[PDB]
Design a protein around this ligand. Structure first.
Ligand SMILES: Nc1ncnc2c1ncn2[C@H]1C[C@H](O)[C@@H](COP(=O)(O)OP(=O)(O)OP(=O)(O)O)O1
Ligand SMILES: Nc1ncnc2c1ncn2[C@H]1C[C@H](O)[C@@H](COP(=O)(O)OP(=O)(O)OP(=O)(O)O)O1
Ligand SMILES: Nc1ncnc2c1ncn2[C@H]1C[C@H](O)[C@@H](COP(=O)(O)OP(=O)(O)OP(=O)(O)O)O1
Ligand SMILES: Nc1ncnc2c1ncn2[C@H]1C[C@H](O)[C@@H](COP(=O)(O)OP(=O)(O)OP(=O)(O)O)O1
Ligand SMILES: [Mg+2]
Ligand SMILES: [Mg+2]
Ligand SMILES: [Mg+2]
Ligand SMILES: [Mg+2]
Lengths: 469, 469, 469, 469
């Protein structure tokens, strides 16, 4: 059972819109909205969305596997060895939010301070003492952004696994000589950095120039979660406020995906007339180029929705019914909707490009969707005794240290080879820390908002400093 | 009673070095070390210091007043109006960590997210609705570092008050016409930004080219806290590890100040021979240029300690007894002391330049001295009922809002016109948030380490995400 | 008769290799090598080439017309109006080296100092007094490189004409409202700058992603000058020194073009065995990325000449027979050929990217090919009386001014609507000035070197300052 | 006899203002204005000046010697060795326009292309073959501005000599070990680059913080050329156009110097009332910060001429009688005087900061003063036979090469150890080339304009390309 299996299972339920029944779905932690900072929902006037991995949740591991296969085929097409074709995507290896160290070719799981939690070179998990040769202080400078690449999104899962596959392959293939910073192949030297860049370029290529979008849209039922509650929730949002879409995807792809997401023989509720997807939005904006969108952005363009091409020129006109925008900036949204940042709840899956940047640059309210949480919560509750044991081992304070390392490993392995998205044993990950700091609300799915009234006061406890406690 | 009065009062006590007595001083919160992240003191191998406002705590309000007077005199000398000479420093106005908005000429107290807590234009405190004209989302982009200047250090207290004095003066002087972004004086326009830059330049000038250092060293007893426990604590540190100084001040000034700090008729304890200050340090480094120090730094130079001039050339030799360094980088410290970052506890008063930068760039352990905490703790305990009332007003949830604003104001005024360093009512300041995030330990004075054994395990509770709780 | 007709006519002659006959071809200025700075040919140890418009001279106006047609079709495909399809390339309009002013949408012919010689808005030639509104000092800041784009190469001829066609079209089409900096189309505004960028992008697109290369290679006889003397001259160069190719084109295209250039039923001379083109070069380097090539360059790669793909990795091996390089830098050439800059004669057609940059950055000796010179010389000699009259009108110095403007116009029109590449009347162009300053030698074709012995001393008179004369 | 002796000798002559007598002074090349590009003086509407080394020509070698002595004393004061105090300025060593190579510690005389003409390491003149170790192509990349510093101005003469003195001293002092890129002094390494920066900093220091200005103004007759024809010429300029001053010097110094330059017991002519210097200018601007002045400049300020301090604020008012400006940009001049660039003749001594930048950035007309030309012309005519012999040796073309090197050396030595400002033998210097390219007119002194009517047409021959000749 993958995280998307859980989400599609919950998607197959029709909404019992009885108020006591609505409250009741929160009986499961799976259906809750979690709160880092208090948020009075009655103050939200605009609900903003992105599409990819938020409205359109790609099915796992099928979609990752497709991305992986196509990225591999692109690398082979540009001259990587044929052996790459024998790789096959393994969903048990990657966890999201890992850092690829381009100097030494390691995948690292780090905390908020850049401290090393896990280090894998290919499929070799390097124990603490061995990591000290390359990381003398068990630490990386996180924002040495030329050296370290943070794999933030679900789109990065295939390349997370591929990077490890490639390092493993080249290390164990006798044609190549392993060196500190890459591989020697006679009179050719392939640095981990150049290899990484080839992988990044190939992933971008499959999405923008290759066949990934075409193959997705060919079999939407295989690749995209569909939920009749999505149009319902969106209709309720539009009754109390304004609704907008700001997607990094282009119009033609957005139209195909959104059409599928709304393709039911009814509108918001069974028995109601079907309405086009565009009717659910007061403002539709594509080619957003987030995170740049939240700064200077790009010139505002208008999409010709008949051809899917941009009209020539900068668009200087007003918000009109049926207009679709391209580019622009977050100020375009605020201006056209008559909103200030704190009147906006932006629902994002990109912790950096949606959530951190909208919060920090614009003071928007934020809702982070974390699709894996569905499965992570299951593991978290199912294996509660392991964490509980770890806590009491940490408490017990006058060997033992090695029992802590044992229990940490067993707990971590329940999630996969790279552990929980949120922690390694008792240490929180960078990702966890960024969720807490920048996501006002978070959940497995934004659909969970269906189970709360729009007057709800989401509450978090006031924080006190140690000297105040 | 100022914060420095408290510190000098505690300084006048001789250390009763009986172990039960040592533990007992922590009876007062005043003498405690506060813990944001756990720290096992037995793992610390190097204790690092800065001088200004850490080892050499300048007396308040005398030192701020001197800086203020000299900065005013410098502005008048370059052609500011004579009326500036009638200003007089008022310690009740400034709180540290405020942000000067150079566009609109406001002092702002903000939270970690850039949300406005307090806004004063001159001495006019602008209420929430009036702030919306200039700050439509009650928010600033914090790291628009060209527009906003964060007044982080105790050295910035005089200019915090002076900026408000200047805005008040020009606003109410009929020769000047108030405009949105500054003042018109016939055919001359003085922007708030150019005014701010003149103030910054004048403060730097008094410290580096003017008479402030000369006047300080003329009357050290008036201007600098002196404590016989300082040599004692430093001697205990050097028995268990290495001790270093990395100061942004120059050698001649450092030597004068440090000589005074160690001028007792004994060494570490009464009855022991006096030893020179330099003997307490394994490494002494001046002209550090923090925060650049924690990145590329500057070329390593050697001080000629007889003349106080730098020797000509880059210093390429080893660590030897009696050598004094200038410039260099944090790597100089690590290399020469045989340390990794996590073996170092750096004791700083500059939340950005000492603590945030050493933590983020190098993974050093951090101890933040907050001289005002002595007085803030007194107010915090003395007026506990006001905060308690605020908490219960916030709790009480089905008018009232205006009672919250009332009680918030009364609480805040107990600290001064700009409120507590750490909060406005129930909202934490940027400064508070940065202390929690980057200072592993903090206290009113690093001398509080005297009351803990060097095997002590400083403990903070493990943090859990909302879905984990 | 186009310039390429002259070059192909001279190309059809077999070389009479008798020494008196060889000297005799210089009887015509058409066959001479012109000298800006003295150059002793015996000191040249390496002869370097580029391919496009040097070895492979594209036929005119057929090749420009093809580029124009394909660029137009690309613009229409992205949504420019259908009327673009009625444009047809006119070789009589563009002269090379014009500057497009992206602010005001003008093509400008300028001197070395940025003084305006000609200004055309669309097909409207703006007289001197009217230019003062937009150019108050009849001057542009040349190296405001964001505003002004210099159309240096023969590849830029189609876009030179297209820019004028577009400005003319939009100006005279009633759907658009002409504004100072572009065109208004209802709620869309198309700046001259955005229009220019679309044109630049479309020209790059047709060359790198579209069908231009495919259509060229489909009909090489229509599009490329072929000359049996090319292999002869190259063989003579390789007898006295080393020969290299450094082209911005890729290997697959280079191989197709070079194969055609060498496709005769003999080698260097009639009766000799045919040899592959690669055998004429000691070093072959593609994807050069000039002008960056003459600075840091890019990593050195090796071409797999069987597949035409790059091998994976940086190439660290030596110069070997049959190796083909990609990327690298000018230092790659020097190192592998054992050359210093002044031992190298680089034969280029790009005044900036080949000639100015190799001279200024590396002190290479330079030979500039100027394909138009064949036709320009014909006009220059044929209409000598007009220039002579202008000179004597300028001399005659005590009306007249307007006769000078008349004769200047008649002279200029003999070359085309934008005049001579080298002048407008008595004023030299930027291009002329850059040829004189950076091209040690220049000619209509590098084949003209066939008519000089390799011991020849090319001589230019020593320059004296006015006070030295 | 120094160049300033010639200028002061000509300064002592009263102007015989008879028209035939005025023309007659041009009998001597010393009194001519030389022409690189034609200039119709009737079109000049504004005459612009700088002060230092143009209006105020500092006497040689006294002024250079003073700068040298004070710079040496500053270096010794910061800790350079006492032996520096035994250096004494030698006017026979430096020529202006040399390039200091900070990597290898050489003074280089180069041509326009960066080719090496002379290379001296200390006082050791390195012959051609020995230069190849450090300069393999006998070439430098001129605009590697971090490595190479061009000593353009007469203010740079002392440091030109001092750099050679320092390299010579450290090389021959047994305490120091000579290395490729500087000197080792035990555990201190002094790079040529750090040494150079210390020298540059010390020269700036003596001018802006030290005693050079004070010592100059103490003995103006010793240090500054004074000429009764200066007020006469300026008065004639103001009768036909506008006159402005744009100086990099501050107001207080400008006022002292200009007062001295105008201190005669008469105004423009004997018998006329004396007028203050300021009355000769329609616009006076100090603190110009050329060359930045010709780009964005700095904010426009107003000088309080009573105190010599700047008024607080940006000056937004109009041009009024008696106003003195500070900062601003070249656009300030154009706007306030109602001028376009080609209506302005700017009279400068800084080939880069006055002449190249005003020409290239603004299309101003340019007049370069070259104080040394007075003496260079004397040598040029006196030793004409040596150059003539060189020309005929170069002509004679079928040993000899070594006779050319001999005669080149003898010619060069007539000017000093670093040869003529304008050439080494038959090769022109960078400086000569920049004079020709950017200075429309040039002369030993701008006073030479007194000998030409303001309707004069300065004529230069039209330039032809080799193929046009
Ligand atoms: N999740 C992320 N993905 C990619 N880049 C990131 C991420 N978080 C931070 N960065 C980049 C942006 C900055 O250049 C740099 C500094 O990060 P750092 O200040 O340590 O993190 P933070 O949580 O305080 O957020 P921010 O970077 O916005 O300040 O790292
Ligand atoms: N206390 C401070 N004083 C001065 N500048 C600061 C301070 N804190 C942060 N900055 C600067 C450095 C960065 O350019 C910018 C970004 O800040 P931000 O990321 O919002 O804060 P932070 O607490 O995450 O620390 P950091 O800036 O190191 O990432 O602000
Ligand atoms: N022919 C050209 N094409 C494109 N850019 C040019 C050309 N010539 C010069 N430039 C660019 C490079 C510089 O950024 C800028 C400065 O030019 P400028 O100094 O006036 O010309 P130049 O003939 O002295 O050559 P250079 O630019 O190399 O110094 O213009
Ligand atoms: N006389 C000079 N003094 C100092 N810097 C100079 C001088 N001449 C040119 N430069 C600088 C400015 C540029 O960064 C760089 C490029 O010079 P280069 O293009 O070779 O000379 P140039 O005679 O064409 O003038 P320009 O530099 O203005 O283009 O050198
Ligand atoms: Mg998304
Ligand atoms: Mg300090
Ligand atoms: Mg070419
Ligand atoms: Mg000057």
């Amino acid at each position: 059972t993958s995280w998307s299996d859980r989400l599609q299972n919950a998607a197959d339920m029709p909404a019992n819109m009885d108020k006591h029944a609505l409250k009741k779905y929160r009986r499961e932690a799976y259906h809750r909205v979690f709160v880092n900072r208090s948020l009075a929902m009655e103050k939200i006037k605009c609900f903003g969305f992105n599409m990819d991995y938020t409205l359109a949740v790609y099915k796992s591991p099928e979609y990752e596997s497709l991305g992986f296969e196509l990225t591999v085929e692109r690398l082979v097409s540009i001259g990587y060895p044929q052996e790459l074709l024998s790789f096959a995507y393994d969903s048990t290896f990657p966890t999201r939010g890992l850092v690829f160290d381009t100097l030494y070719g390691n995948l690292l799981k780090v905390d908020a301070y850049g401290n090393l939690l896990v280090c894998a070179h290919g499929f070799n998990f390097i124990r603490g003492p061995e990591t000290r040769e390359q990381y003398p202080n068990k630490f990386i400078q996180r924002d040495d952004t030329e050296r370290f690449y943070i794999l933030n999104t679900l789109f990065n899962l295939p390349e997370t696994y591929l990077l490890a596959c490639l390092v493993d392959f080249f290390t164990n293939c006798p044609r190549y000589t392993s060196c500190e910073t890459g591989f020697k192949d006679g009179d050719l030297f392939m640095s981990y950095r150049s290899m990484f860049q080839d992988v990044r370029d190939a992933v971008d290529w499959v999405h923008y120039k290759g066949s990934l979008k075409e193959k997705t849209v060919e079999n939407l039922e295989k690749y995209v979660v569909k939920d009749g509650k999505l149009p319902l929730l969106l209709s309720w949002m539009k009754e109390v406020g304004k609704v907008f879409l700001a997607t990094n995807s282009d119009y033609k792809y957005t139209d195909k995906i959104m059409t599928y997401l709304f393709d039911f023989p009814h509108g918001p509720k069974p028995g109601s007339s079907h309405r086009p997807w565009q009717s659910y939005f007061d403002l539709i904006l594509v080619d957003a180029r987030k995170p740049l969108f939240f700064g200077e952005g790009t010139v505002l363009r208008q999409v010709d929705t008949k051809t899917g091409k941009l009209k020539i020129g900068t668009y200087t006109g007003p918000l009109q019914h049926g207009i679709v925008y391209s580019g622009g900036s977050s100020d375009t949204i605020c201006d056209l909707l008559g909103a200030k940042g704190k009147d906006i709840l932006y629902i994002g899956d990109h912790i950096f490009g949606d959530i951190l940047k909208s919060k920090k640059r614009q003071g928007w309210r934020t809702f982070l969707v974390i699709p894996e949480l569905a499965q992570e919560l299951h593991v978290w509750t199912d294996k509660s005794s392991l964490f509980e044991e770890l806590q009491s081992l940490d408490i017990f304070l006058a060997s033992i240290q090695r029992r802590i390392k044992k229990v940490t490993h067993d707990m971590d392995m329940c999630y996969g080879m790279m552990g929980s998205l949120f922690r390694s044993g008792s240490r929180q990950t960078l990702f966890a820390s960024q969720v807490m700091r920048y996501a006002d609300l978070y959940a497995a799915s934004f659909i969970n908002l269906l189970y709360y009234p729009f007057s709800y006061l989401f509450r978090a406890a006031h924080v006190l400093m140690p000297h105040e406690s």
